Structure formats: C-alpha cells, structure tokens
C-alpha cells in the first residue's frame, strides 16, 4: 500500500504543478509535426493516472519508469530552451526532488 500512496502524492503534485501543462494529456500527433516519428513510446500524466487508479502498477519502480519516460520523451523531442523544454526541465527536477525525499 504505502509504496503507491506516495505515487499518488507525487502524481497529484505533478498534475497540479505550474509547469505541468505540456504533460497533462497525450501529445496530439496531428498537431505536433514529427512527434509520431520521433517518440516511440509516448507517456503523459493522464495515462499514468489511468493506470494508477486502475491499479496497473506493480511497484513504485514502474511508476517512476513512466515518469522518467515522460521527461526522456520531452528532452528527445524539444529543445532545452523551448517552452516545452523549459517546462519539462522544471517538471523533471521537481519529480526527482520529491521522489528522493521518500526513498
């Protein structure tokens, strides 16, 4: 239980974060030119939320894997000085920050 409760806390704080807007819903490939070709395994906060409520997380490790997948995708597709890039850096630093002050 207590392993996924802090996953609920982390995901809640990330969902309500100021810099969270580029990762709340899945990237719409019809809108983002080149995203389908470059990102082979897309991930966002809503998909992690769905899988968390539906229970499909065996441990905190798969959850953390999905978050790091969000930010790996962000850094793969967007420049570090793009708006999505800067947001993604703030969100990644926030996630590792809060994740480390539990484990």
Binding residues vs ligand EN2 (CB under 6 A): 22-23, 27, 31-32, 73-74, 77-78, 84
Cβ nearer to ligand EN2, comparing 4 with 32: 32
C-alpha neighbours within 13 Å on the C-beta side of residue 89: 8
Distance, in Å, from the CA atom of 84 to the CA atom of 19, rounded to the nearest integer, reads: 9
Please, which residue, 4 or 86, has the CB nearer to ligand EN2?
86
- Least Cβ distance, residue 101 to ligand EN2 (angstroms): 25
Handedness of CA 98, 100, 4, 2 (dihedral sign): negative
Residue closer to ligand EN2 (CB basis): 60 or 78: 78
How many other β-carbons are positioned within 10 Å of the β-carbon of residue 44?
Answer: 18
Q: How far is the CB of 51 from ligand EN2 (least distance, A)?
A: 18
């Amino acid at each position: 239980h207590s392993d996924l409760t802090f996953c609920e806390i982390i995901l809640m704080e990330m969902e309500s974060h100021d810099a969270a807007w580029p990762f709340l819903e899945p990237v719409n490939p019809r809108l983002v030119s080149g995203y389908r070709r470059i990102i082979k395994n897309p991930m966002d906060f809503s998909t992690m939320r769905e899988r968390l409520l539906r229970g499909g997380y065996t441990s905190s490790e798969e959850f953390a894997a999905d978050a790091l997948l969000v930010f790996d995708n962000c850094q793969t597709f967007n420049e570090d000085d793009s708006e999505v890039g800067k947001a993604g850096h703030i969100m990644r630093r926030f996630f590792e920050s809060r994740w480390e002050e539990f484990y």
